[PDB]
Symmetry: D2
């Protein structure tokens, strides 16, 4: 009668040390195996409370549980995008070509200016959060957003094409307090094929999470 | 070399008095003409700052503007979905039908369990916000979420199918502090024909807009 | 043994129509009997869950209950300060004198500038919240702060001297969406004797409550 | 003429290695020199913008700057309390005594229970934040609260007695993702005599700073 779909941790698209020297192998493991894994569990934990409520098996503090859901569900959605959003230098890094390159110049004027806006947004996230590029469906335009925690300030219905995680656990062991150096080096592992992939879908008015 | 798409206030699908005595014509007028117009304006003002920045004609407080943009943009998107999510009683109200009646019963067990979860999320919003129903694309399931202000707690990439505004200006003039009764009466105007259309687009792997 | 002190709704320092034509009696009535009461209620409810928890008598989602407590407790504290912060025209309105007038000139240049900063802080709160003037103990200076909801952005240890509620239920019935007109008119009922007493307590290194 | 009072980084009460093995000297150094210095700097940076606005020397995005001031000011105040809140094993650690130990039993029943409520609040702060024990003046009782970032959820006028920093930079280099071990190991350096004195102030209806 009542059914909820559960989440699972996606395997990384590469080896934990594949992004070195930009992101340490130890961070990659902790980030993937501990942090991302925790969001998957948190999402299911909240979903199970909701199912128990829906089955009439228990009451519920809907505000608390839905806050839990949003936080965890987003941590998971964003980390799922983050991993394939990167790749070993070669497949990753460099300048973008294709539609993503076109649209970037169109809305930002140049790749460099796009990097400035995105990198500055990432470096200036207050507390933990992300810097992301989304395709805005309503008026069809690229927009860079700052995200606090994992769920604050997303554009309703918008599709995340590229995300940069600036939660301290995403860089501290390697870069320490120097988030800025992390943000700058990260450009060396960005997978534009992945981003172009998602842009291809969003451009057609599609959701661009899978593939 | 740099462009930013602007937003405009969408026309209501009906007269202001269309939802009475569920939502007064005064509230409908203010909410739309004043409040919603404000969000369109705020979003555009933020873009103007970004456009200037991207052109190099000016600097920018990226955190400030991205926080601004996120707020107003969501205010605009959610209200644009909010209006067609309702209709003059007869065309609005009743119960769900179609793929949405099927999914609601699938994930919640019944329409009454759904109405209970959604209504409680709405009534239990802390401060000003919304109670929404979205299609979650990663595990393809329907979820109800609480949104604080206009931009807090959205699920990245998810498609908003049904939105219920619980900001005081959506009900106070009529129901005063009784947000609970505002919530209960609201179901008598829900345009389930609109929600179904949105779910159909969502299921096609499309964005729940422009349809 | 375990005991928690509970909160109670304090009486207004004047009748429900004492602030007209600046704040209608209906607003004052609702805001006091319904809203403020709701916060007192919320704080005690949260404390009853904590007490049960401390008596080993129950379990607890510490994040959910402490989030509830902080919001409601601040709602109560701020409203408790808000009522005596005003007074029927005569005792309220005009410019400040005594120490507060002095400190205001010292830190803002003049009362006119202060009122500018304060009104703009209040007119620009995003969503519901407050504009508050506090005495910063650490470095001894006046500061105006924006508060979102009742608990977001307060300065640790600081003493609230003057509070202006910009939640819609504090002005909507009369000013509708013109919060600005509301804020401008609010200066006519500001009980500067109250502000002064609180500042003097702060200056004394004391908590600015109870007179 | 307007003046603002600037903030300065306070020296630690002990050597950087003075709290090992519980908190590494690298953390202490980075935490103090980079992070705390950043908040003081950020607080002052906001004051500079506020100062010229008051001197009619420029315009101001009041929401932007007051949001900035709240975050940085709180970071400075809370860290300023955080440092003396700890002490090298000997002067720090063990259980409380005097008034604080006595009050912890009144409101929590036992030190054991208090430790559970405080530990659970700190381990369960969503994102980055603090767990704090304050003295709530209005009804005169000990309350534990969760703080997100440095400025969300504080209780107006409340005096912070003991603060625990759970921002990842406060532990990640040593404890990695295990916030739980960090929280548990921290008690071993708590300066109960400090919490005692601040409680004395609060009990004296005074502000708990500069002593």
């Amino acid at each position: 009668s009542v059914t909820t779909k559960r989440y699972t941790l996606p395997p990384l698209p590469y080896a934990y040390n594949a992004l070195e020297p930009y992101i340490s192998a130890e961070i990659m493991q902790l980030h993937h195996q501990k942090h991302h894994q925790g969001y998957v569990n948190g999402a299911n934990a909240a979903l199970e409370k909701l199912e128990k409520f829906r089955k009439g098996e228990a009451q519920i503090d809907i505000r608390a549980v839905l806050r839990d859901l949003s936080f965890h569900l987003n941590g998971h959605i964003l980390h799922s995008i983050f991993w394939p959003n990167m790749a070993p230098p070669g497949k990753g890094g460099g300048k973008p070509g294709g539609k993503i390159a076109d649209l970037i110049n169109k809305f930002f004027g140049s790749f460099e200016k796009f990097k400035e806006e995105f990198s500055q947004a990432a470096k200036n996230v207050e507390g933990v959060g992300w810097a992301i590029l989304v395709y805005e469906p309503l008026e069809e335009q690229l927009l860079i957003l700052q995200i606090e925690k994992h769920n604050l300030m997303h554009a309703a219905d918008a599709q995340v094409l590229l995300a940069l995680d600036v939660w301290e656990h995403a860089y501290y062991l390697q870069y320490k307090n120097d988030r800025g150096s992390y943000v700058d080096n990260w450009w060396n592992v960005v997978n534009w094929d992945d981003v172009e992939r998602r842009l291809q879908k969003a451009l057609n008015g599609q959701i661009a999470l899978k593939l």
